Design a binder for this molecule. Structure first.
Ligand SMILES: COCc1ccccc1CC(=O)N1CCC[C@H](C(N)=O)C1
Ligand SMILES: [Zn+2]
Length: 140
């Protein structure tokens, strides 16, 4: 579990979005596993605007932050689950690291701010949904 709080927006994994999130929807993309809902209180996260491929992510199943090297946002095949059928997830970045079901929502950050959130996991791999191209998150 986990979310990004930037301005009056809440960014979560689309598969973990609540009843309240859909009623307060701003934008969602099933192919990216992202949903953005509106908030009443202002958030304090800053989104990175960069092409960093190194950063640190929070792993809830280990209660630890791990430094990682990660791939550029890409269209990656993701096995069928209870949330989505087998499909191509876009804007996904992979790294060699621990991830388990329950770790989605953990933030990945670089020196410029928030890069993205944990969205997928494999045998020794972790996948992050990138948010750096969502320029509108900084305005209104
Ligand atoms: C955070 O790692 C989860 C994980 C680790 C290790 C094995 C399996 C998973 C679950 C998994 O990858 N998915 C289930 C939830 C929706 C995800 C999606 N974005 O399509 C895919
Ligand atoms: Zn950066």
């Amino acid at each position: 579990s986990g979310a990004i709080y930037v301005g009056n927006y809440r960014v979560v994994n689309r598969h973990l979005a609540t009843h309240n999130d859909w009623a307060n929807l701003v934008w969602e993309d099933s192919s990216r596993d992202l949903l953005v809902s509106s908030t009443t209180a202002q958030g304090c996260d800053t989104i990175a605007r960069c092409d960093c491929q190194t950063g640190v992510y929070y792993c809830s199943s280990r209660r630890k932050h791990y430094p990682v090297s990660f791939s550029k946002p890409s269209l990656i095949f993701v096995e069928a689950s209870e949330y989505y059928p087998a499909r191509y997830q876009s804007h996904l970045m992979l790294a060699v690291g621990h991830s388990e079901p329950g770790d989605c929502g953990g933030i990945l950050r670089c020196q410029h701010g928030v890069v993205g959130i944990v969205s997928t996991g494999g045998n020794g791999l972790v996948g992050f949904a990138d948010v750096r191209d969502l320029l509108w998150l900084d305005e209104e």
